[PDB]
Each structure stands twice: as structure tokens, then as C-alpha cells.
Amino acid sequence: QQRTSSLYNKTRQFGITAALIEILSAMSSLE
Amino acid sequence: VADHKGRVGHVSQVIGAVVDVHFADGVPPVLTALDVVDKLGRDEPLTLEIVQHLDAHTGRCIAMQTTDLLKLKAKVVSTGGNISVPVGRETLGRIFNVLGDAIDQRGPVGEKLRMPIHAVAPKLADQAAEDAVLTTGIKVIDLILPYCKGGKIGLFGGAGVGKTVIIMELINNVAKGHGGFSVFAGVGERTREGTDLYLEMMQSKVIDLKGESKCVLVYGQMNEPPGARARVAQSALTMAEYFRDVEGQDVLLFIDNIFRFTQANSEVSALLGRIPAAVGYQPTLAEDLGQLQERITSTTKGSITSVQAVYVPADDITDPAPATTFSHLDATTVLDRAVAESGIYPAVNPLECASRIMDPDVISVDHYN
Amino acid sequence: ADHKGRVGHVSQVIGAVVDVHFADGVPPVLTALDVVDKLGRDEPLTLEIVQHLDAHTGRCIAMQTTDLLKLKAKVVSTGGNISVPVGRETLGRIFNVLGDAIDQRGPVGEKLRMPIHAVAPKLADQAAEDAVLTTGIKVIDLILPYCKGGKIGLFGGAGVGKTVIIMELINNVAKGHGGFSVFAGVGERTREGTDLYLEMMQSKVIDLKGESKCVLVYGQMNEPPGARARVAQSALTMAEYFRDVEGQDVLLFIDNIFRFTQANSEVSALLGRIPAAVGYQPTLAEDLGQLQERITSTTKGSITSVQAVYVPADDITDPAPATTFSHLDATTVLDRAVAESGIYPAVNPLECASRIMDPDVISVDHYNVAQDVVQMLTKYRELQDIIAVLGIDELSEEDKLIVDRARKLVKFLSQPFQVAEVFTGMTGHYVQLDDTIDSFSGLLMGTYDQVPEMAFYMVGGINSVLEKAKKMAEEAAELEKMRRARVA
Amino acid sequence: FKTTEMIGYVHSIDGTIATLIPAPGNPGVAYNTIIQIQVSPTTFAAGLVFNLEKDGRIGIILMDNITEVQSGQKVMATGQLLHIPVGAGVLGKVVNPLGHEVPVGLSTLGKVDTGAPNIVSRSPVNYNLLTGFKAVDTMIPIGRGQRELIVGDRQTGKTSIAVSTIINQVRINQQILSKNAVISIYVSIGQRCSNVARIHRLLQSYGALRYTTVMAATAAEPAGLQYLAPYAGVTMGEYFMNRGRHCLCVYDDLSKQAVAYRQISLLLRRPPGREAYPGDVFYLHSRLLERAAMLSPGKGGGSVTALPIVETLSNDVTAYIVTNVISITDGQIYLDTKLFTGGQRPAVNIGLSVSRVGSSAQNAAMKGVAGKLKGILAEYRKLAQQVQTIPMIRGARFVALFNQKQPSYFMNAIVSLYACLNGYLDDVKVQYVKFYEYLLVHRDLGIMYGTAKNKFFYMYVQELNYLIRFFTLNSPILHGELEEMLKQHTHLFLQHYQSKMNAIKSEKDVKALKNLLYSCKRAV
């Protein structure tokens, strides 16, 4: 339970980094 | 003296709360407050704080109130410096907003002085060389997780466990044992929760209308835009800094909630066009908390001792907003619901709690053992 | 070379990336440029053109630091690409990305210089020589055997045993090897470079007075990204000379190939390219393509490259290792949980693979035994999830015997390395291929069921297992006699 | 700083970053140089050049007086890289990355941008560096010129173990020749301001300021200073290294440096990658830590030892900044959170911790005892109802001995470990090991009661420390004389002092026993 919750929490944060890098890498292409 | 005092400018661009201002005789400094003089179609005034400079004549700002009805080329005038907030014993008993205007309808404040919101944190020489115990007069705290002078203190606990009761008791007990006043930064708080604090303090007589008051309230609530909710933590801290530095006194500060400071800055940082760091927070997350939390410390002149609420989003303690805050904190107070429901008040679970000054060097050997 | 001393001026300086304006048109791509202008520098500056912006302007990358560089500074072409010395005069000497000797032992004898950016061999030049390179290591030789002419990759996270395994391979294989060797110190520790240079001088693979059989080309962490990117190719040019011209079997040692990709990721950002997945350059697959394809066994000679591959954040799905995996012949994967449990080397055998793991290349007895180890370990990982949930006692009668053997297989896969005598506190073990196959074969049969588990941990072949089991029986007999001494 | 030519005007500001427009003529400042912005007629504000655009515009990283910077202000150039004050005169003072001294309550310069020593410039690490901890100096021994990481969670003792390592040098440095003195450089990156003050007082009370200089970039100060703080720290150490002397560098911590560098990179639109950090965040720590080294006999044989601290979140080594620094440094000292709360302080996880050049770094005497301890603790950890072997008894006493607040002196450490190795604390119980060790060091039982008669070897004579380092304990000179001291100490402690534990079954005496034993954990 400890180690799966940590993976849920890592995936939560890693998801939002990766979400926003893609979204803002879009508008660098659009100026 | 005060240069750039009434220097006139015009509104160049308005995109949400973020507003650009063109000045003919050069732009003011950074963090400079600007009153929008134009128009009487608004019901409340508009005050802009400069965050960035674009060119020598243009400067980008953030609105403390809503930016409704704001036309282009509208007349804007400087204040003289940063956003100025009233200080001293005339503030005690009164409620305030981010700017320092009284929001309680009890006449004009007695203010003999005003101080700027964006003060610099104390230097190395100003810091105390005696880590000293702040006796709260409470058994669980003083014995097991003693709060120190200058300390950042953290109040962990779910809904309806005894948070507002403990803050009120600390406002009483600071004033009993050290004679100190208190300040409450309602940072991004519910407006309806602000009424219940004001009434319960009036019933218990920590705030008194007819007589002596020992509390200050500075509220920047959820209804307000991000510019206010961001800066309102510093407004309260300026008032506590006056009681620390000038009056030379032990003072309490109460920030509910310090996450809402970081979250408020996360909104403006997005609108300013800055690229977000980890988990969509502002890239200056550690720096924002740095300049705020470092001002809260025990100087040679006095001691501010801030108890803070910290929201852990999604119960994820690894999140940047709490994780960055944990380094700054001295005494972690954890309140448990099962302890409250069993009959023990205050509901402090002593095993999950901890304090930095729980050490044979700081406190006495008999205290530690 | 007509563009030989063609003069230009520095248009823009943003980090290591520098733009240069040429009056009479820009040089070609990959063209080296010396910055002639004086400044307050201690060391020179050399720029390589990567892109062209217009007919008169060309974007570059700095091999040295770009400190004190003013705008409009005089820059002059060399005549072609960055040129590096080759041949037997290079052997024994240390070099940098450019090819200057960095060991203070006089000028190099260089009879020739070759460009760093060579083109990869065509399809017709390729040739397969499927022979087993016996590394003397149990996990490698049995499960993922390295072949002659093979490109081999050591994938693992920070501090798992990549540099330890390269050093053991230099002991085990590179000493008794009639060919020469090249070591590309690509963006790794400067202090590790000294220990290699000294240990080779002590063992006399590099010799000052006499014959040398090693070349060192170092572009370490202290150097800027332009050097660390290009330094892998400089070493590869020297190995290409021994392969193509001299017609010889050669070893190449790239520690670390991730630092090539990471170095290109820095410049690619400063060049103004839009990043691909996880912030790497969009040309990540192409950068590795042109580098790794040059590393191959031609008809003329044969490179046999061991490479180290850093897995960032222990994320094997990351582009930098994931893209590299396709290029390799024997993929060695090192796991952190295996290292922390006690098993060194930290080789996770299920994620590993080798092309020559085949009944045609290796013997039938080698393949059949090696497959049974992989099969048994696959069953064991499924059983390990059941023990965590239910318990050890809940398993079946036959499955318990599989666990006893599989637990011994994991322990017997560990090996005390000869370079790691300081770490382990025990002498090394070179385990023969015939010893490795026979000992593992008997363990699968169940001939060593009565042998205890800790006998197999950190030893070589079967003789050392039975030796440790004898020592365990004798010491257990003594401690039992001590507790049997007192009566009533 | 020294002004030269007025290169341009300030155009835009964005917190701690700015861009300039060139003045008429377009002089053009040099890259990576300092520039002074005239905030007022009297005052200046420093800044570093990071971008030289084709337009003529110049990107600036602001450092001082950031509130006072404004658009339209004049900008003077130095035309030089960042040099700072370095030498013996800078010791016992707090200083910025730019070199300005910080006031506290009551010298030829050196380049910050410098290349590390090359392959032939360095040499193998042989000189030991004592942290003053029995756990560290035996199992994870640090050599002079080594880079030894300190990792673990918040409040696990990362600073204390680094600060006490600096304090441990004073007892040696005072007695030894100043050629071999370990001069320390504590870099405080992104920390709280009061924490720097408490370390200043703690260094001052133990006489450490004489042999130490404190680099400081607190949380109030901007990201530009935090970014540059470890680089300024090494510069000050390299002076001692290049002039044939040994030095120590603590960076507390590189996690907050990376966050400061990420802020700078993100604010200037540098493409982010893993955990939003830029591409070259590995290169940031790599060129820093590689400048720490052990030079050859040909270049003085000096050293800069590095102790980088890196905070982990919930014991997660897989984070990008943590995994980067592990791959650069020569092993680590892992501080576990469960060991901290469990009792063991410093909370050194020996299984997770490692020194890549341990054996060659250690002293000849320390190598003798420590080689055996690895065998005992390996068997103790594996074997851990009851059933006690000799390894199980002696192994448990080592764990009790490793607990300590302040650092132990080399003589007082090695003798108390040698006692446990040969089995002098076997009859002594586990709870009374610190009382046994205290009475060994400060007091002495042979000289107390009667049965002394040792010709030279005693514990009050601290000067024997350096004789032990030469000859070792296992040697014909000291072996017989040492084994007397320990035999007298054990027999008298068991007879006279440990006899009380069978007695003492009352309230004002059991509490008196506790308060005695609690205080014994602190003093080694």
C-alpha cells in the first residue's frame, strides 16, 4: 500500500509536468 | 522626500488582472503601487502594483481589485512607493484588506504611520543568538513540541478538530504571558468563515469594541482576484513587523492558509506569461515562500512567531507546495480526529508531532528528559 | 580546400552556440573555425558550424568556453572538419576532442590526420563473424553472451556497476588481446580517467619506453557541451583507422554514450529547436544513428564496442536508452533493486538479451541450459508475487523445490570481480565457459539441492561453491559443539 | 567592481532577469562578464551577461539591489569575468557569491569560472579526512580530494554531520603544521537566514571560524546568487589547493541550487525536460564537483574535498537531481528517516551508504580495526527467540557506540572500537555502553582505585593520538600496554560501576540512572 501510493503520487506529478511541457511546447511553435 | 510621487501614466493594455501602463516621464520602480484616477462608473476603486518593466516608458502590473469597466488610455497616478498599510496600536480590533482600508464600517482608523507591504527580510546580524522557548501556557505544546521565539509553526488537522479554537487560545495566551498582540492573515479564506472568527473573538473579548483589543484581522478572501490573495499575506506581516521592530514585543501571526499564498501566485505567474515548473506551479515557488517566510523570524528587536495552516493538495505530501514549506518550519503540530472524539481536547496527537527546539542545548536538561 | 582561410566575424553569442557572419559566403556544414581575435583568454577557441541561417551567416558550437567573446570578433576557417591524428603514433597517448595531446609527453608522431565526421559504412561493407567473446563472467557468458565484432551496451541507473563492469572487461578480455584499444571518455569523471591511465601504466598495456596497445580520448564533465558531444566521434575516427586502413580487430570503450545524447540536448536547446518527448532534441534518433552505424564490423576490419548507457531516473522507457537498445547486439541491463539486495554484478537477466543466444552460434548444451535459467527465473518472479500476498508455506510441493533452486540461481549469478577486491574484500574469480555451463546445468537437474543457499552467493564456479560449503559445514560444526559443551 | 565603459540602457526587467539596449556606437560587452547598473548616482547593482543577441541587446542576470533596478538606467561594464576576494584574510567571515562581506551580530583574487584539473594533474587519494564519526570514518571513509555525497530526507542530520566535520578539524588543525590543516568552506545555498546565524555561533564557540569561511546565499536573496554560490565556494578552496594546501567544501544544498537554476532557465524560456529542469542541470553540478580534486605531486599535492548535500523526498533516490549528483560523486552517506526516529544519530544507513575510495583513504590504524567491523556487522545484520553468538553480542555494541551528537577525537574513537572488536564490552550490557565509553575517555578507573601501573598508555594523554596513527594498536609497541588499560577498565566497571544495576529498584534512583545515561549519549 505504501509503495503503490507513492507510484500514484509520482504519476500524479509526472503527469502534470508532462501535460504542461507539451501544452506550452505547442505555443512555442505558434510564437 | 519622495520623488515620482504623483507621476502620471496611461493604461496601455488590459488582459485580465494583468494591466500595462505607459508613463511619459519614465516608468516607476518595481512593486510600485498605482491608483487609477479615471472614472466614477465603478463602485470600488482600482489599484495596480507594477511587477515587470517592458521598456523605459511602459510597465506591466497586477490588479488588486477587479479590472471591470477599464478603458484604454485611462489616467493612472503613482502613490509614492509600494502598497502602504497602517500599523501600530490603532490597528488593533479593526479588520483590514490587502491594501489596508478598513472593511468593518467602524469609522476611520487612527493610523499615525503607514509601512510598505514588500519589506526586506532581516540580515544575519539581526538574528537572535538565543533560540528561546515561547511558553504557550498549554501542556501538550510546551512539553512535547515547544514553540520557539521567531518560529514558523504548522497546524496540521482536518475539518472540525480544534484549529480555530487553538488559534484563539494562542491569541489569549500570548497576551497573558508575554502581553503580546496577534495578527490573522486570512489568506484565500472563505468570507463566511471570517465572520465566525470575528464574532467568536468579540464574544471571548480578544477583540473589544468599547475597550482594549489584542488582535488584528487582515483578510484576502476567495472572492478577491489573485493579486490581492497573493499580497495579503505580506500586509498582515507588515503589521506584525511593526510590533516586532518598533514596539519591541513578542507577537503571534496566523496564516490560514499558506498554500493559498503559493496558489494565488500560481495564478498571476500564469497570467504574466512565465513557464510553469513541476506540477504546474510558478518557477519562483521556492523564492516566493523564501521572501515571505524569512521575514517571519526572531530579530534582536522583537519576535514574530507564526502559526500557519498548510493545505496538502490531494493528500500528496511530495507536492512542491507543502514539501518546500517543510524546510522553513520549526514546530509541527498534528491534530487527530479520533483523539478529539475520544474526549481529549486539544486534540493533539503527540507521536506525529515534532519540534526543532526539543533539544538539550536549547531547553533545559530536565525539560528534555 | 578553397574556403581555406576565409575570414568571418562573430554575429551573435548565446551560450556555447555562436553565429558567424562571413563576407564571401559561409563555409560548409561541420566546418571547424579558429577564433583568431585576442581577448584575455588562457586557452584557444574553436567553433564547428552545425547550421546555416542565410548565405552569409552560419550557426556554430564552441568546443572550449565562450567567455570574454566580444561581438564582431575575427574568425577564420581551417579548411574542413575538425581533424584528429591516427595510426600507431597515437597509441599510448591521451587526447582531447580536437586531437591535441593532453599528457605533456612531447609532440605526437602523427603521419596523418582524419576528419571527426566520417560517413557510416554501406550495406555491402557489413560482415557478420559470429564467435563468442568469453568475458569470464557468469551472468554475461551464460545468458547474454557477448560476440566478437558486437556492439554491446551496459544499461543502468546511477551507481549500479557500469564503470565496474567496463574495468572488469578490461582485465578479463582487453589484456590478452592482439588488437589495440580506444577509450572514449565521453562526459564522465576526470578523476576516473587518471585511475585508468595509472592502472594501464602499471600493467603495461600503455608503455612509455616501449610498445603501447591503448588510446585515450577524454572529453569529461568539466568540458562544455560542444566538446562532450563531439568527443565520441574523435575516438571513433582513431578506431576507424585501425579497422579500415590497418585491417585489424579493435576494441572501443564509450563511457558514457548517454553523455553524447545529453550533450547534444544542451546545444539543441540553444540552437532554438523545438524539443521532442521529455525535453530531448528532435534529432535524438538521428544523432545516435550516424554515430552508432559507424561503430560496426566492416569487411576491412572489426570494431568490438563495449558501451556504458546511463538510464536517467531509473526510467528505461526514457528516449536516451530506449533508442539505443535497437542498435546493440548484447544488451546488458543493470537494476538498482538487484544491487541493493546484495547481488553484484547487478544484472537483471530477464530484461537482458543477446543476438548470438542461438543454437547455431553457441553450442546446443549452452543454449538449452541458458534457456532453463531464464525459464526458471520467469517462474520465480511469478511465485515471488504469490509469497508476498499469501506466504511461503502456501506454495505447492513442486513449486517449493523450484523456489529453492531459483533462489540459488539468483545467488549463483553473483560474482566477486577482480577489479572489485577493495569493495568485496575477496579475491576475484574468472569463471570458464565450460565451468559456467556445467555448474548451472547440474543446479537445474537438482544435483546440488542438499548444498546450502549461501554457498552459491559471491563465488566463481562449482569448485568454489563446494569449497565455501565445506567451510560452512566446518564452522557450523564448531559453533554447534560450543552450545553442546554445557550439560545439566 | 571596476567600471570601464557605458555599454547600454536597461530595457526590460522580469524579476531577477533583464535585457539591455546598446548605447549609441554599439560598444558591445564581453560574454559572461559582470556589469554595474547605476540604480542611483551613488549606488550600483551588479549583474552577469548570459545572452548576446544579434540585435545588439544583452541579456542580464540581476544579482544585487533588484528592487532598485529600473528601465532606462545606465549600465557600466567591467570587461572581466567574475573574480572574488580569496585568501587567509577572508577566513572567519560571511561572504556573498559576488564577494561582499556580510555583517554579523554581537588577498589576490581568483576566477569563479575555472576549468577543473586534467588527467595528469590529479593523483590517487591517500590522505585521510576525519569526519569524527565512528560510523563514517570506519565504514564510509572520506579521503582528501574525494567528493562524498550526503543524501536523505529533511531533518535527518545532513547539515549537522557536515558542520561537525568542519568542527572536527579544529582539534587537529590547532596541534598540526598549518601546511596539512583542513581549511573549511561552508556554502549555504537557499537556506533560512537564522540557520546561518546558528551555524556561525556554533562554529565560533568551537574555534572553527579561524579555519573556516562561510559562503552565504539565503532564501531572501535572489536565484542568481543561489545559482552562483557553490561556484564561489570552490574558487575560495582552489586557492589553497593550487598553493599546496588541503581544503574542505560543503554545499548545503545542491537541491536548492538546482531549483534556483531552474527558475533562471524557465524565466528565460529555456526548453525544460525531466521535472521541468533544463537540459544542462547535470552539467551544472558536474563542472562544480569536478573542480574538487586531489592534485599530483607535480602541482603541490593540495586538495579540495567536497561534501555536497542533496535533499530527497520520502527516501526517493530515483528523482532527477538526486540521481545526477550520485552519478558524479564518489559514493554517498545515506541518512535514513527511520533510523533517525529509531534512535541512531547520526542516522547513517551503512548498507545504502558507500565510499568508492575507502580503503586507500583510511589511516593505517583505522584500516586495522575497520576491516573486521565489516565482517561483524554483515553477520549481525543477516542474523538479526534471541540466541546470541559472539558476533551478535559484539555487533550490537558497535551500533550503540555509533550514536553521537558532537564529533569524536581519533584516539577516543579508535580505542572504544578496538575494545568492542577484541570483546571487552561483552559482559557489559547494551544500555551501559555510553557510560562505559564516557568513563574510558574523560575519567580513568585504573588511576582512580589503585590498580594502574601503566608506564605510558593512558586516555588523559591526548598526544598519544599521533603515535597510534603511525604504529597502529596491533603493534609490539602499544599492544600489551593498551590491553592492560582495557582490562583494568572492564574489571573495575563490571565490579564497582555495573553492580548498581542489580541494585537501584526505587523511584529517585531509576530516574537518576536514566538522566545519567541520557547525557552519556551526547558526550562520546
Added chain:
Amino acid sequence: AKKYDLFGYEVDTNTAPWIEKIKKCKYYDEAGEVLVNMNVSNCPPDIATYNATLQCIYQSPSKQSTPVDNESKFCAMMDLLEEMQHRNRLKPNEESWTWVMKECVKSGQFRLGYCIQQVMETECKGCPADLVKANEANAQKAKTEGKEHPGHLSQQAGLFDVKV
């Protein structure tokens, strides 16, 4: 003869110029500053150089102009021996340990003197009388005058009550 360092570069064996610098000593911390300056100019300390340093430690009064806390000529002296034996790989000759014995009897630290005559007798042939009787004189001097050792340690019974 010729000599080479660990890499194999040429090394300056010309010791004599740096020896006369150590003779003009005045205070013994200046000797270390010279020993630094030789190594910096690729000139490793000779066996005679260490003995020339050991002489300066004995003769001069303290470290420098001001006195440092816990000076100890013996500890500074024994550190230098550890440097030459282990790291630089040089056996100290008979002259080396005779300088050590002199400082024990001069300062009055006789207890060290007992340990180092045992060393001098076993390691480097012998300890020729002169200082042995001078060391034994200081041993009897402590006994007859008052007591040997601090004395604060000896008298204190303690037993459960011990200050920390």
C-alpha cells in the same frame, strides 16, 4: 641519481636550496610554508629535509607571532613523521626519532618519552643514554614533588554521581 614521480615525469631532486630556507626558521609554522613551496615547484621533501624541519620544531618557541590554542610541538612533529612514512613512503632514519625524544624531556612530557624510547630501542637500532636518564629524572620529579597525572582524575571516587 635520477628520479621520477608516479606518472613518470622528471622531478627536482635539488634539495639543498630549500634546506637553507628551513634553517632561517624563527617560528616553526614557517617551515611548513616552505615544505608547501617545494612540492609546488615539483621538488618532493628529501629524508634530510624532514630532519631539518624536525630541528626547527625543537629550537623555536611557538607556531607564529601570536600563540595558538593547544600548540603541541610533539603533535606537529608526529604528523610530519606520518606524512613521510605512509604517504611519501620514506623510513625515518636515526636522526628523526632523536629530535622527538629531545622535545619530550625539554617540555617535560615524560610519559610520551617512555613510549618513544621503546620505539627508538625497537625500530632504529637504539636510544643512546643521554636523554633516557634525563627522561627518568622527570619521571622521579613528578613523584617526589606532588603526584603524577592531573590529580583531579585520581582522587574523584564518583560512583553513580559523575558530572557531564
